[PDB]
Amino acid sequence: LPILLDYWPSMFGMRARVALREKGVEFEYREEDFSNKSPLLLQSNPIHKKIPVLVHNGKPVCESLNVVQYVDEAWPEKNPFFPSDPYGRAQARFWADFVDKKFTDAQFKVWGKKGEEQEAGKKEFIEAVKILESELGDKPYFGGDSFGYVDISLITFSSWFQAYEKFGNFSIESESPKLIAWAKRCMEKESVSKSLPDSEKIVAYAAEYRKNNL
Amino acid sequence: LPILLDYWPSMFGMRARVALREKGVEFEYREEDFSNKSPLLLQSNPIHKKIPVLVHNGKPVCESLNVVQYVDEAWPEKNPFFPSDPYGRAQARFWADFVDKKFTDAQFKVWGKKGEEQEAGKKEFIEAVKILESELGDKPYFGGDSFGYVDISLITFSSWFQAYEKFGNFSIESESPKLIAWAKRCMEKESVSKSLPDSEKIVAYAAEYRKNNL
Amino acid sequence: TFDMNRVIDEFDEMTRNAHQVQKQTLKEILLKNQSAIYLQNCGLNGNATDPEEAFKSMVPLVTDVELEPYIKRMVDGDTSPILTGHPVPAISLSSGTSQGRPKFIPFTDELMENTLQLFRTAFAFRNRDFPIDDNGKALQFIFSSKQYISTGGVPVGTATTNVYRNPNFKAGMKSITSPSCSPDEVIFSPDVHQALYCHLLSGILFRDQVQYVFAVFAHGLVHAFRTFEQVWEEIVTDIKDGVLSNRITVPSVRTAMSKLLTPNPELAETIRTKCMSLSNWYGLIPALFPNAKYVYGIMTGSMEPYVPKLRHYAGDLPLVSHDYGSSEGWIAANVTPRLSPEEATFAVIPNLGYFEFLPVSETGEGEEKPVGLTQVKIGEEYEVVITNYAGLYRYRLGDVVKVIGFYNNTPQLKFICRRNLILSINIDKNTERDLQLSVESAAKRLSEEKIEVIDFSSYIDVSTDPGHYAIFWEISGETNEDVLQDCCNCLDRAFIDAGYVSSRKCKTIGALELRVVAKGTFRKIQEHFLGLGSSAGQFKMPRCVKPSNAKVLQILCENVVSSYFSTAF
Ligand SMILES: Nc1ncnc2c1ncn2[C@@H]1O[C@H](COP(=O)(O)OP(=O)(O)OP(=O)(O)O)[C@@H](O)[C@H]1O
Numbered sequence: 001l002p003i004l005l006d007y008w009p010s011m012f013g014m015r016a017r018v019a020l021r022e023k024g025v026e027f028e029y030r031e032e033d034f035s036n037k038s039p040l041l042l043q044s045n046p047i048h049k050k051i052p053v054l055v056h057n058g059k060p061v062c063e064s065l066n067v068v069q070y071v072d073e074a075w076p077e078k079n080p081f082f083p084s085d086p087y088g089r090a091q092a093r094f095w096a097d098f099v100d101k102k103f104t105d106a107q108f109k110v111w112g113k114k115g116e117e118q119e120a121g122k123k124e125f126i127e128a129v130k131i132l133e134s135e136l137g138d139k140p141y142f143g144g145d146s147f148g149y150v151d152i153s154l155i156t157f158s159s160w161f162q163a164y165e166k167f168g169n170f171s172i173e174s175e176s177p178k179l180i181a182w183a184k185r186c187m188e189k190e191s192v193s194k195s196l197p198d199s200e201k202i203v204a205y206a207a208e209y210r211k212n213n214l
Numbered sequence: 215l216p217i218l219l220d221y222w223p224s225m226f227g228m229r230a231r232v233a234l235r236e237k238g239v240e241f242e243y244r245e246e247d248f249s250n251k252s253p254l255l256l257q258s259n260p261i262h263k264k265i266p267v268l269v270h271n272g273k274p275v276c277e278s279l280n281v282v283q284y285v286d287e288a289w290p291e292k293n294p295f296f297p298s299d300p301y302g303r304a305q306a307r308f309w310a311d312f313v314d315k316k317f318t319d320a321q322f323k324v325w326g327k328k329g330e331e332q333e334a335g336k337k338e339f340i341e342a343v344k345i346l347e348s349e350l351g352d353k354p355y356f357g358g359d360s361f362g363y364v365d366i367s368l369i370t371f372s373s374w375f376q377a378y379e380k381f382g383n384f385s386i387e388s389e390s391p392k393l394i395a396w397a398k399r400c401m402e403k404e405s406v407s408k409s410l411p412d413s414e415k416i417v418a419y420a421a422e423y424r425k426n427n428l
Numbered sequence: 429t430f431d432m433n434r435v436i437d438e439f440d441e442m443t444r445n446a447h448q449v450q451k452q453t454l455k456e457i458l459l460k461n462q463s464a465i466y467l468q469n470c471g472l473n474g475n476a477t478d479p480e481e482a483f484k485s486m487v488p489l490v491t492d493v494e495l496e497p498y499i500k501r502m503v504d505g506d507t508s509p510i511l512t513g514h515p516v517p518a519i520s521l522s523s524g525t526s527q528g529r530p531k532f533i534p535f536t537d538e539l540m541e542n543t544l545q546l547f548r549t550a551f552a553f554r555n556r557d558f559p560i561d562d563n564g565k566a567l568q569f570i571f572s573s574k575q576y577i578s579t580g581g582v583p584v585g586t587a588t589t590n591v592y593r594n595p596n597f598k599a600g601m602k603s604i605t606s607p608s609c610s611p612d613e614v615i616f617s618p619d620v621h622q623a624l625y626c627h628l629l630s631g632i633l634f635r636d637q638v639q640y641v642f643a644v645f646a647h648g649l650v651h652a653f654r655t656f657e658q659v660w661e662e663i664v665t666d667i668k669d670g671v672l673s674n675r676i677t678v679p680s681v682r683t684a685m686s687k688l689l690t691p692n693p694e695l696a697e698t699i700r701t702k703c704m705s706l707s708n709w710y711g712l713i714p715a716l717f718p719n720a721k722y723v724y725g726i727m728t729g730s731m732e733p734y735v736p737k738l739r740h741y742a743g744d745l746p747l748v749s750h751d752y753g754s755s756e757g758w759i760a761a762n763v764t765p766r767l768s769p770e771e772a773t774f775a776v777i778p779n780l781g782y783f784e785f786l787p788v789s790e791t792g793e794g795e796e797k798p799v800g801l802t803q804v805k806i807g808e809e810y811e812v813v814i815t816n817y818a819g820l821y822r823y824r825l826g827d828v829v830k831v832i833g834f835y836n837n838t839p840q841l842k843f844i845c846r847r848n849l850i851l852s853i854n855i856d857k858n859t860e861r862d863l864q865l866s867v868e869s870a871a872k873r874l875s876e877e878k879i880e881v882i883d884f885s886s887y888i889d890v891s892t893d894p895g896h897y898a899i900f901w902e903i904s905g906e907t908n909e910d911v912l913q914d915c916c917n918c919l920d921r922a923f924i925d926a927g928y929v930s931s932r933k934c935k936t937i938g939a940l941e942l943r944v945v946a947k948g949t950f951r952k953i954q955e956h957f958l959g960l961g962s963s964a965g966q967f968k969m970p971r972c973v974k975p976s977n978a979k980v981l982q983i984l985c986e987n988v989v990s991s992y993f994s995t996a997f
Pocket residue numbers: 518519520521533534535536539540542543584585586587588590591592594752753754755756757758956959960961978979980
């Protein structure tokens with residue numbers, strides 16, 4: 001059974017968790033201690049030493065999105081994540097990059113920072129969620145006619161939504177109800193109803209992060 | 215007729231041109247004045263305003279790595295950059311992500327900055343060309359048994375090697391020779407041999423950048 | 429002591445004497461050497477009264493494969509004498525190949541005598557036609573800046589370099605040329621690409637007294653004026669401020685040029701004006717030194733296609749044809765230099781050797797025996813077979829010449845030739861296609877610099893441990909070592925076979941040495957070959973040199989403008 005080296009509060013590890021659960025793969029979950037990383041984490045990824053890492057057939061796959069694409073290409077029989085068209089997978093890649101970079105930079109600034117960077121990040125976050133709001137035109141999901149690739153990529157920030165709400169002092173739902181509510185449809189799915197830890201714990205965790213570093 | 219929005223020194227623009235020329239497309243280049251981003255460009259990426267941009271079917275395709283796999287999916291009959299297995303795909307993508315991160319900033323650091331900044335970037339790229347040389351191992355290329363996906367991805371950095379060598383006042387060859395060595399090999403493909411500008415000029419562009427910001 | 433009337437008269441007399449002197453030339457070549465081991469297996473002792481006939485009946489025709497082992501016996505630690513005789517001061521190489529492979533040939537001072545004399549005679553007859561000033565000078569695009577020592581401590585040399593670095597070059601040459609614009613050390617500079625730049629700069633230096641524009645070839649000339657089109661602005665800058673360009677990296681020649689410079693602004697104004705008034709640089713040569721009477725070089729055969737680009741350069745200036753012979757033996761001279769390059773013919777000088785010719789008349793080829801030199805028929809076409817002091821005795825060089833006419837009793841010859849061509853199967857390869865591909869592969873690292881690679885060669889060094897390969901590149905100019913060192917790695921990385929792989933990976937054959945040489949090394953090679961006596965089928969240059977190839981090989985070492993051993997591996 002495929003082995004995930006992961007981190008419970010991580011949204012990215014969640015992306016991999018989502019992908020295997022949506023498919024129908026049976027797998028073993030592993031919690032890494034970055035303070036005392038397990039031998040398989042060091043042996044699989046000797047340079048960056050980061051999660052997630054899925055070992056399937058004795059061959060390691062690192063980074064979250066690279067795993068998600070690895071999950072889709074390895075199992076292409078039931079629920080395909082991408083469209084059949086070159087240009088449609090194109091836009092999903094374009095957008096997974098957007099969620100993964102600037103969206104993830106603005107939110108990291110929402111939960112991991114103070115003062116001007118926080119306010120700046122808040123302005124960014126609402127724009128980015130507004131932009132995401134905008135790409136949807138207004139679309140139930142992202143990646144195909146069902147659950148999809150950039151859905152997977154972003155639905156994991158939904159367990160931190162509560163944390164951004166709290167630390168950023170903003171309603172992502174009053175300003176973009178559709179996106180939070182895009183998350184709450186997807187929350188009916190077991191790949192999101194089992195994979196994402198309680199937002200309460202993430203909220204507690206990220207706050208706790210604020211305590212350890214200054 | 216595919217229309218490329220490109221920049222004479224964009225390593226990334228070169229990723230696009232190399233990828234397309236590697237494949238077998240007859241296309242047109244339009245050189246960009248980023249002080250005056252084009253009407254069709256401001257319509258392709260109204261926010262990023264960033265190139266390379268390949269326009270097919272009147273549909274803008276953006277981001278360099280994104281564009282090259284667009285190269286792959288757009289004419290899937292002749293020259294594939296990936297091998298048949300999904301794992302091999304994940305490895306090449308994985309290694310595509312690698313060139314994009316510490317590699318690019320480190321070089322950005324070697325030719326764009328100086329002093330305390332420079333040496334950090336300096337040991338960073340020798341380290342990169344070292345893990346690089348380690349994974350190159352023996353293969354004539356990277357992303358499969360022939361010219362690959364990521365071949366396209368890191369080859370275009372081999373014209374800036376001259377800038378890195380002089381401003382860093384280094385020689386990246388005696389520490390990891392097989393990489394630059396692999397590079398002038400890769401220059402024999404008609405994709406990079408006609409898409410890539412002169413290095414003395416590229417050195418001079420880095421010199422213009424440097425003289426402006428001291 | 430060079431004089432016009434007496435030298436031509438003795439020449440005239442020598443030429444009608446053609447038979448005495450040819451026949452006597454055979455006597456002294458074998459009197460000098462009745463001791464050849466090769467001749468022992470032919471059964472010679474000399475003298476006799478059927479001596480000539482004895483040589484033609486007893487002494488069988490020979491090839492590059494059969495002369496390769498002996499003259500190779502000369503060169504490599506066996507300082508031993510063989511086919512001609514004495515351990516020659518230097519050794520030779522020949523275009524086309526000894527089966528894709530190297531061919532050595534002996535050098536003695538005699539070949540210097542032939543040189544000094546044939547240039548004595550060629551210059552005299554031409555100064556009869558194109559009189560020069562006794563105090564003037566000349567733009568000689570001539571080079572010989574390289575000297576290598578073969579594995580036994582024995583020198584092997586190019587026809588260029590051995591004239592020029594010979595102890596009798598300068599003193600023998602003083603009277604019959606107008607003095608050289610180039611100090612000898614730039615001519616002999618470890619960088620003749622930069623030196624050719626300094627050679628332009630030198631010819632350009634005393635322009636008004638300069639009496640001719642020279643190269644052995646039109647292509648040498650064309651290479652210079654195509655390059656002169658490229659760099660004239662840069663050149664005006666160099667001579668201008670009193671400071672030579674940062675392009676020039678060797679200290680001896682930089683010592684030479686700084687011994688020559690001071691800040692002078694007026695002429696930059698001038699040169700810019702003239703260089704930009706011209707039509708695609710037509711008539712450029714008289715534009716430079718207006719008062720040179722002639723452009724001189726070999727114009728016939730394989731260099732005919734370089735006559736017009738040069739004509740384009742030469743304007744309306746008369747193009748005079750150079751004479752004919754080499755280290756492998758001088759053959760013919762132009763005593764009527766005023767004739768056009770398409771009516772151009774060269775006449776034999778007899779005491780240089782004993783030459784015999786193969787008639788091709790029957791079909792192709794045709795089973796006929798060789799006839800006397802003047803027993804050769806007018807209008808018909810024979811191949812040249814060479815006997816002299818150079819290690820050739822009744823030897824087939826492999827190329828066809830036409831007898832157009834006679835100067836008195838000595839016959840005028842014509843060349844419509846190119847390649848001495850058949851080939852055979854190599855071992856200095858590493859498929860020719862792999863070697864060409866090798867250069868092609870790393871060279872584009874240079875193409876990044878808006879340069880192109882002009883020519884290449886290669887070598888097997890088994891004095892060393894482990895022995896290593898050497899690749900040589902002729903190109904468009906100066907650049908840094910780091911790309912070159914990168915490039916060496918690719919030559920190595922371009923030899924595609926599994927084999928080169930097994931060894932050097934294990935390391936039993938040493939890391940290939942890329943020794944970057946300078947502009948026109950292979951032009952030195954082309955220039956010596958076509959001018960070489962037999963018939964212009966003389967141009968397929970050999971690509972990699974076994975311990976049996978010497979012409980490119982003296983030119984090999986000393987202008988290591990850079991020479992690097994792979995820092996890979
Ligand atoms: N055609 C020719 N061109 C230039 N030099 C010639 C020629 N013929 C004879 N020589 C003369 O021979 C000289 C020496 O060249 P030399 O005979 O030494 O070289 P080599 O060692 O015999 O072998 P190679 O064939 O490489 O030149 C020169 O001094 C040179 O002038």
